[PDB]
Amino acid sequence: KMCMNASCGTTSTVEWKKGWPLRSGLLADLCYRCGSAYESSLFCEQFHKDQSGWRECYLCSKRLHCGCIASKVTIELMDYGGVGCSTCACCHQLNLNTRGEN
Amino acid sequence: SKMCMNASCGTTSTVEWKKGWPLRSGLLADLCYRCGSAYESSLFCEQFHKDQSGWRECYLCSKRLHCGCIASKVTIELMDYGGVGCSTCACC
Numbered sequence: 455k456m457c458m459n460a461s462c463g464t465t466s467t468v469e470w471k472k473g474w475p476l477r478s479g480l481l482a483d484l485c486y487r488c489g490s491a492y493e494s495s496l497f498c499e500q501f502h503k504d505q506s507g508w509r510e511c512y513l514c515s516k517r518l519h520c521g522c523i524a525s526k527v528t529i530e531l532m533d534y535g536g537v538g539c540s541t542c543a544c545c546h547q548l549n550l551n552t553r554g555e556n
Numbered sequence: 557s558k559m560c561m562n563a564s565c566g567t568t569s570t571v572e573w574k575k576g577w578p579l580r581s582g583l584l585a586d587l588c589y590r591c592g593s594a595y596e597s598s599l600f601c602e603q604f605h606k607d608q609s610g611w612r613e614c615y616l617c618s619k620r621l622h623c624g625c626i627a628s629k630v631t632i633e634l635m636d637y638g639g640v641g642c643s644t645c646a647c648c
């Protein structure tokens with residue numbers, strides 16, 4: 455077993471954790487440290503700040519790492535563009551197309 | 557009735573109504589002739605989203621891919637250890 459965080463890649467750990475769904479549908483192998491970051495929904499915040507793909511939540515402007523398998527399960531792609539975080543995606547965007555036309 | 561669901565357009569007047577990306581409800585987005593034509597050509601984000609955040613380069617061909625965007629969801633594959641590829645690149 456090898457931690458699938460590319461900045462880590464360790465084969466030694468006290469506890470093997472599970473991460474994001476890989477292209478196979480299997481869950482990634484992460485070491486204790488990296489898997490703890492993932493479980494707290496702060497993996498990309500701790501390891502991916504130099505990468506492209508960050509967007510701000512449509513409602514609260516929280517930074518969300520898009521185009522990244524490690525945040526795929528915590529990011530919602532919104533109907534009219536943009537992204538919503540775990541909190542703000544319980545709601546839908548009201549754009550000017552909702553106007554009493556119905 | 558209809559209004560273009562491309563938020564920078566919002567037109568209600570078009571020669572022909574077309575369909576875009578799937579919405580959460582399962583319905584397809586309404587798009588005017590112009591915006592729907594861009595979606596059909598696989599050029600929607602190039603035509604409308606270049607100044608938005610979220611763009612990444614394909615790991616193989618370096619095509620610019622608009623991530624975190626429902627309108628390009630269909631063409632972008634999230635790679636196992638990070639990054640993206642074109643759907644047609646990533647199978648390699």
Ligand SMILES: [Zn+2]
Binds near residue numbers: 484487
């Ligand atoms: Zn690790």
Ligand SMILES: [Zn+2]
Binds near residue numbers: 498522523524525
């Ligand atoms: Zn990330």
Ligand SMILES: [Zn+2]
Binds near residue numbers: 539543
């Ligand atoms: Zn939010």
Ligand SMILES: [Zn+2]
Binds near residue numbers: 560565567587589590
């Ligand atoms: Zn339009």
Ligand SMILES: [Zn+2]
Binds near residue numbers: 600622626
């Ligand atoms: Zn886009």
Ligand SMILES: [Zn+2]
Binds near residue numbers: 615616641642
């Ligand atoms: Zn490519």
